[PDB]
């Protein structure tokens, strides 16, 4: 009866495709034909943040848009004050292989993870001095690719074991395990309302999970390679996925289908990191060609190029106030980029 | 104001302490070499980690790291065994390693093609084009014990062994049959044909047949690492 289930799966997939085709009344490029072009946007490196030894794999901005946490492959988590390019804390890490870092929205805890399979949560505002490992979360049978804090107590971590998870820091145990991805879950982003989160995997898919319920609401397909960068629209009703097919794609939750594909013939490298500006008009995508590209989101025009990194730009993040964009590369450098009037 | 001035002075003092610690860490980091152990499950890579963990000290959760001191030169070996069989995404964490020790079973003849395909994949990665591979053809004793005993001729797989002669260079061990040499160097020549028929001038493959003597293996790793360091110094000096 396996053949019967396969036939039923094919029929349901065809039905969903037909529903999507019915819902595709027009193409986003048609509605955004009348938009005045964003113009050539040229932001400069306001501050270069040096001090890391090995490559920088992931960075996260704090809610105050001033402190940023950076993970390096040498085993270092540095909390930089972007305004004065001064390092506040330099946490040594047990396992040097770090691929994710998170700043708690409360600005108290810093998360890290990687090839050690463990999400290490570090308390910064301790009763005493120094920075110590507040908690270590184990239970993921794969490399931790992205970890994000919901509150000061709950953290969602996506791992290479084709699984995302929700952890209670105090309990130290998984509360809800999100399964259904076939490939390794690489990037994970939360909605502005921390109710749903969309996770991109290596199976050329993204999935919209409900945090409390624990079920995969929708699955978005369309990429031809690994979705290795995810980022919610500031509205919360769309997201952007960067893949190794050298394409970014704007998927939409309500229509449950792609809206538009940002790609160019010149670029053949995969996209490393994807971030939406505060207004959602700009998609800053990091590429393997040692530079970032700023696309228009509503149109598909390449608004700008953030050249200035020697190696691939591994991490990219816009601040909550949108005033700056930090791009960290494999050359042990993060650069803050800001636009000049 | 005064309070702001005191806060900025404190921030600069913390930054200075962090910079001192980072300078010390940089000294240690440049004093240690990164070795990534890759190979099949039948290959004895874990045996290698244990062999040099209890020979010069070592650290001792997924990654089985170890750190030792061979003639004052620090080495940081590590094996990633806690992950899944998909490796296109975490292998990228090892682009700056000094070397990749690829341990090959070299005694089963069934997974040898799988080993060659893995070697090709490692050799051709954009993130591993600049990384030299120290190839450790392990299980030489078993290779011999099967080659003399007959039973399963190697010619069944890899048909080119029918039209293969022992390389004129050669280096047979004191007591050894010519057939053992031919099989051994045929496997090594398959690996070197995979290595050389690709990017040159950025990374090299160092072949070594693993023996029961541990000191020879550690010496080969040390010598290969020294060659890699000298070659990367040549490249950074623009004399290559």
């Amino acid at each position, epitope marked *: 009866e396996l053949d019967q289930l396969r036939q039923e799966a094919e029929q349901l997939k065809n039905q969903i495709r037909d529903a999507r085709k019915a819902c595709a009344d027009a193409t986003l490029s048609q509605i955004t034909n009348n938009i005045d072009p964003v113009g050539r946007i040229q932001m400069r490196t306001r501050r270069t943040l040096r001090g890391h030894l090995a490559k920088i794999y992931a960075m996260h901005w704090g809610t105050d848009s001033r402190l940023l946490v950076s993970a390096s492959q040498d085993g270092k988590l540095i909390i930089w004050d972007s305004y004065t390019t001064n390092k506040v804390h330099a946490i040594p890490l047990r396992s040097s292989w770090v691929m994710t870092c998170a700043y708690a929205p409360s600005g108290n805890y810093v998360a890290c993870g990687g090839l050690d399979n463990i999400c290490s949560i570090y308390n910064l505002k301790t009763r005493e001095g120094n920075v110590r490992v507040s908690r270590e979360l184990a239970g993921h049978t794969g490399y931790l690719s992205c970890c994000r804090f919901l509150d000061d107590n709950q953290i969602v971590t996506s791992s290479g074991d084709t699984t995302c998870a929700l952890w209670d820091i105090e309990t130290g145990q998984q509360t809800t395990t999100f399964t259904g991805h076939t*490939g390794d879950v690489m990037s994970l982003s939360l909605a502005p309302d921390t109710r749903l989160f969309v996770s991109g995997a290596c199976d*050329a898919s993204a999935k919209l999970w409900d945090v409390r319920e624990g079920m995969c609401r929708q699955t978005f397909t*369309g990429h*031809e*390679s690994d979705i290795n960068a995810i980022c919610f629209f500031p509205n919360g009703n769309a997201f952007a996925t960067g893949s190794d097919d050298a394409t970014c794609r704007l998927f939409d939750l309500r229509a449950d289908q792609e809206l538009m594909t940002y790609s160019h013939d010149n670029i053949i490298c995969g996209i490393t990191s994807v971030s939406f500006s505060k207004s959602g008009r700009l998609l800053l995508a990091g590429y393997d060609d040692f530079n970032c590209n700023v696309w228009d989101a509503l149109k598909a025009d390449r608004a700008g190029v953030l050249a200035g990194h020697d190696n691939r730009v591994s991490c990219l993040g816009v601040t909550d106030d949108g005033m700056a964009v930090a791009t960290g590369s494999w050359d042990s450098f993060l650069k803050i980029w800001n636009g000049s009037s | 104001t005064e309070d702001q001035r005191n806060e900025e002075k404190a921030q600069r003092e913390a930054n200075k302490k962090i910079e001192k610690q980072l300078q010390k860490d940089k000294q240690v980091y440049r004093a240690t070499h990164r070795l990534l152990l890759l190979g099949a499950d039948n290959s004895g890579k874990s045996t290698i980690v244990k062999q040099m963990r209890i020979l010069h000290g070592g650290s001792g959760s997924g990654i089985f790291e170890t750190k030792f001191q061979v003639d004052k030169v620090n080495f940081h070996m590590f094996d990633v065994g806690g992950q899944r069989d*998909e490796r*296109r995404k975490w292998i990228q964490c090892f682009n700056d390693v000094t070397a990749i020790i690829f341990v090959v079973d070299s005694s089963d003849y069934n997974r040898l093609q*799988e080993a060659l395909n893995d070697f090709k994949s490692i050799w051709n990665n954009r993130w591993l084009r600049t990384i030299s591979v120290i190839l450790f053809l392990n299980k030489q004793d078993l290779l011999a014990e099967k080659v003399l005993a007959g039973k399963s001729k190697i010619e069944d797989y890899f048909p080119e062994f029918a039209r293969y002669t022992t390389p004129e260079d050669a280096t047979p061990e004191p007591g050894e049959d010519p057939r053992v040499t031919r099989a051994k160097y045929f496997i090594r020549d398959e690996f070197l044909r995979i290595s050389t028929a690709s990017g040159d001038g950025r990374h090299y493959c160092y072949p070594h047949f693993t023996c029961a003597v541990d000191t020879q293996n550690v010496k080969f790793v040390f010598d290969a690492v020294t060659d890699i360091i000298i070659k990367e110094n040549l490249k950074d000096c623009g004399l290559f």
Partner: nanobody, 129 residues
Framework: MQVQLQESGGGLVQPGGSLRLSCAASGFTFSNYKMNWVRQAPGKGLEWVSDISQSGASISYTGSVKGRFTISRDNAKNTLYLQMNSLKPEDTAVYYC?????????????????????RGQGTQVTVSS
């Protein structure tokens, strides 16, 4: 759309026969993806068999299929072909076509993995007499 690779062909064939396995791929630009053929023998793991590059210039095989089998890559029809000459009982296996991970690359790893996204369901080739 979804990455799909449907394989067709394969069946009971007497030893020494020939058979064409056709993998029709949809959902991606067939042109710029190195493509492999991987089989799985019963009671055994997945073994890479052949690979062909984007333009078709580079074709590589294993020892057991060095001269017997051939690989074709029709870009216009978005199809891959494995021609199977002088079949042997050692070839009784489930055959899959694998679009290896990244475009414009030949350094692709997870083609023989236990779980792999861009791999077809496959066709069962039995060479029972």
């Amino acid at each position: 759309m979804q990455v799909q690779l449907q394989e067709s062909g394969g069946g009971l064939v007497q030893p020494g026969g020939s058979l064409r396995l056709s993998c029709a791929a949809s959902g991606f630009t067939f042109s710029n993806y190195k493509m492999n053929w991987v089989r799985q023998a019963p009671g055994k793991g997945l073994e890479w068999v052949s690979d062909i590059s984007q333009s078709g210039a580079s074709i590589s095989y294993t020892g057991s299929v060095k001269g017997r089998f051939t690989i074709s890559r029709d870009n216009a029809k978005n199809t891959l072909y494995l021609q199977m000459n002088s079949l042997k009982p050692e070839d009784t296996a489930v055959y899959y076509c694998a679009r290896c991970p990244a475009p414009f690359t030949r350094d692709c790893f997870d083609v023989t993995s236990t779980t792999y996204a861009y791999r077809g369901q496959g066709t069962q080739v039995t060479v029972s007499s």
